[PDB]
Design a protein around this ligand. Sequence first.
Ligand SMILES: Nc1ncnc2c1ncn2[C@@H]1O[C@H](COP(=O)(O)OP(=O)(O)OP(=O)(O)O)[C@@H](O)[C@H]1O
Ligand SMILES: Nc1ncnc2c1ncn2[C@@H]1O[C@H](COP(=O)(O)OP(=O)(O)OP(=O)(O)O)[C@@H](O)[C@H]1O
Ligand SMILES: Nc1ncnc2c1ncn2[C@@H]1O[C@H](COP(=O)(O)OP(=O)(O)OP(=O)(O)O)[C@@H](O)[C@H]1O
Lengths: 571, 80, 26, 169, 176
Amino acid sequence: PLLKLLPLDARDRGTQRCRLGPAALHALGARLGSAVKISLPDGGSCLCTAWPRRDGADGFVQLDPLCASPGAAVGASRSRRSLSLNRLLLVPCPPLRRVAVWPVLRENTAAVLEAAQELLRNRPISLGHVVVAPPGAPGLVAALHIVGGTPSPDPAGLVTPRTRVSLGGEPPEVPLGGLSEAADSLRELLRLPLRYPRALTALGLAVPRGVLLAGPPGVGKTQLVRAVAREAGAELLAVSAPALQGSRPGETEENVRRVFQRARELASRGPSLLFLDEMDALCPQRGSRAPESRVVAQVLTLLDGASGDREVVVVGATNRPDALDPALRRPGRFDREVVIGTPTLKQRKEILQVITSKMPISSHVDLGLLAEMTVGYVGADLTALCREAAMHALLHSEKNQDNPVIDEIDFLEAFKNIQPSSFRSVIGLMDIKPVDWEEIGGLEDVKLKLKQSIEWPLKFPWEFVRMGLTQPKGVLLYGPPGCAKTTLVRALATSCHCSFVSVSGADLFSPFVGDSEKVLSQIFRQARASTPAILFLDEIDSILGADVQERVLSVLLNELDGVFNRSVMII
Amino acid sequence: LQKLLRRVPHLLTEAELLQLANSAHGYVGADLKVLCNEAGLCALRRILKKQPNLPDVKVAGLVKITLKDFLQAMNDIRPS
Amino acid sequence: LYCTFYGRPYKLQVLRVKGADGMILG
Amino acid sequence: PNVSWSDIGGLESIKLKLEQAVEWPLKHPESFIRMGIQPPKGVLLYGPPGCSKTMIAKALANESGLNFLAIKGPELMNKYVGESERAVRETFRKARAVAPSIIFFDQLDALAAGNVADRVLAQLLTEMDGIEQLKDVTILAATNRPDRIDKALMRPGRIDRIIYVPLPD
Amino acid sequence: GGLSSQLKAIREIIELPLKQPELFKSYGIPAPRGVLLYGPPGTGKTMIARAVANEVGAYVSVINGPEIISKFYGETEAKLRQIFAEATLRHSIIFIDQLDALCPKREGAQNEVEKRVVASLLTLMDGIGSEVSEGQVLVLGATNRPHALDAALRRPGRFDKEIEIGVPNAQDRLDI
Ligand SMILES: Nc1ncnc2c1ncn2[C@@H]1O[C@H](COP(=O)(O)OP(=O)(O)OP(=O)(O)O)[C@@H](O)[C@H]1O
Ligand SMILES: Nc1ncnc2c1ncn2[C@@H]1O[C@H](COP(=O)(O)OP(=O)(O)OP(=O)(O)O)[C@@H](O)[C@H]1O
Ligand SMILES: Nc1ncnc2c1ncn2[C@@H]1O[C@H](COP(=O)(O)OP(=O)(O)OP(=O)(O)O)[C@@H](O)[C@H]1O
């Protein structure tokens, strides 16, 4: 005989009551309140008490799962499954003398023990079962796991007001490559404020607590912090807030201090991280609203406050790194920066090999040609290129549907109608192509003078200073157009094996560059960050404006002066 | 360093603080403090590699302050 | 059906009831 | 468009010179690596004035399957402040969208009012550099005077080959 | 008249789902949601929306553009939502026409019905993915100038497929 399943009423919610008809109670031979074990259709089982329906009609079953197998709360009845009667059993309940529970508490020992006695008072329970607290219950225990008992609750049993309750305990995604170089630069900072049970209170200070991530829009900045997240616990209150303000002056400064209040509340025995995103915050035509960045300043001040109290790490991600507040950048709230650049030719192949691994693409597909043809893209557009080449190989297809053959015909078809991302052709580009010294014909004496003033002072620094020779603090090369000045600088960077920050004048003509005093300060800071380095300013007459003229000269003249191997050469 | 801090135990605390003063020839005040940052939290490191895992309230009770962190802190901190 | 929403009387006419066993009316 | 080579006169030497840049990098790229040479990309035509140069560009697009998109010369400098820059980039997106296409740009000497000529030279240079690697899109330009052509547009990845179109013999 | 390549793509895109979502998860991709149609004004985008709803057969929910502009306060967040899953019910194709009304991108002006209706669509379309019960929601956006649709409305999961309906040629005007 088959019985239907119906959703429970508002009076059976959290009462552990099973509503049966009279013929099923005659067939089971049960009294009122006797224990019925229900073997569920989608695995697992539950334990309930038998109570009759008011209507007297037979053919229907309702059930409320409170004592359940873990992950077996499948008693929702949208599809209206039917249960057979062979799945309900009448189970004898001896009384118990000792239980063993493991509690799951909400976000001392005596209050937890008192809340366990109060939940489990006069109930039938079995072994390996979760007892779930009803909604609106007083106290702090959210769940209990049943571990053991001395009259052995394997065919279950009844807790009594005079039983004993004891506490034991035994509870038995895209990897994204290409950011490997910067993923561990993050850990050499943030691992030391994750192994802190007030040990750095005892011996030390506090490495910074205020990091900043920058990069082009599409290199996967938000997914990197979720990867460093899971990597070391943490609940990442990822407060984005692109428009959290309003018409009132600073009405969300009360709101962000409650955001910052639960940074402390969720700081006991566990890591936490405040993840401010899109600190972009557009540029209003008129003066930005006071509350907009004042609270920032509050966030600033608040942040600088986090130093006199319990110290919570803040990782911020912005898109365009310049035109921030200059009172951030000073030692404190925000002084350690990790820069994620546009991808090179090398790991763009390993960007592609991560995405190619999940899809069934056949072995007759190039990678180096797919890396080389895709110059100008970011990591978001390479996923959509591999999304679109899956679609035109499902779009057009055959009738067999057993061999997923994706070939080079529809990768080149999907290359055609995907537009490339902007905000790449700017700032400064390292890595270009290797040029040897033998490609430049003639000019033997100019090669000797360039070697004696920039490569010998950056490669052999002890023998330069012991012989008593000065380092020239910035050279200038001038001549007619067409006599290999840019080739001689690029041959010098290959033999030096150093970083190469190059700014040209044709980079500066783009309208996406914001006013270029702070692009010129961004170039000097990325240089002093990367160590032994060559800063190349090609076409300085276009940079200096052959007003904004006098302001540019000034940011340049002040940086040219204020500056075991160091120093930045300016060519 | 007499008024170094007078706290933060072990340290050197011998008569061979004269040679680091001789050594002393760069800048002060705000660089030397961060020498305490480059000797306080930089004296661990080597403790956490010789043992795999421990509660860090016992690592702070067994902290050792060495001579060898001072020479590398000269290379990391350049006063003026 | 009759309900008084803050003094205003409402007249409701029931056209169709669909219940928990899936059987609808006319 | 419908102009054949026989309507102009069958200019056989200018037929082979234009086919060496728009069809020979695709069909026979082995002969370029056999001789040790980079493949040319952009082609400038110079000569005496008239409508002779715009009919050769229409006749080249007729014999191969090739689509034609035309940008004028001194029209675009005289126009307004803003989205003539957007009209340049919407021409370049429509060339890559459909199929191997020829972008015809008109008189080049008029570009070479300090801020007027330079925001359009910036948008032209940052998008012609996007089709340096793509072999199916070719830029084709016609000018009257080879003297007042800017040397920024004469680098060996952007415009290489110079062909003289004479008065007929 | 004309558009024989581009309407055949719309029908093949609007038929594989609702019928066969097993083929999409056979290879490597989720079943997509956002079909964005655009063109110059006067081309046939609103007629090709009404053409799809006359053939395939579902509940079709049409939300207009210039009549959810003004209101009095934030009544969009009750109206949109109800509109969505309500259709969710008929397991359904959701039409949004004149997308540059509901959402601009005009930062200078900071309007009250502008800056958080963008959070009313990105956080609704990221939750309309019905993977608890494996439902199918298709959003067809039609706009006259998708030049000013935020940069955040082109991300995957959201509006992804963009089909261009351009000005007709001489062979197309013959068939018109
Ligand atoms: N190694 C990778 N590098 C870059 N992008 C990747 C990589 N692997 C996957 N992606 C793609 O990037 C997406 C992540 O986008 P994400 O939201 O993190 O961008 P974002 O850079 O934070 O954006 P925004 O600048 O708007 O804040 C993934 O869903 C995937 O499509
Ligand atoms: N001596 C030389 N040997 C070989 N190639 C040379 C020589 N001089 C110039 N070239 C070639 O000239 C071309 C242009 O050189 P490059 O752009 O480096 O310098 P430039 O014209 O002086 O630069 P700019 O105009 O920006 O000042 C390159 O293709 C280079 O190979
Ligand atoms: N391809 C076509 N064949 C026949 N009639 C057409 C065609 N395209 C448009 N029409 C005519 O245009 C009418 C609908 O206008 P249409 O769909 O072009 O709107 P629209 O002006 O493009 O809209 P929007 O203002 O949203 O940009 C049809 O009723 C019909 O009269």
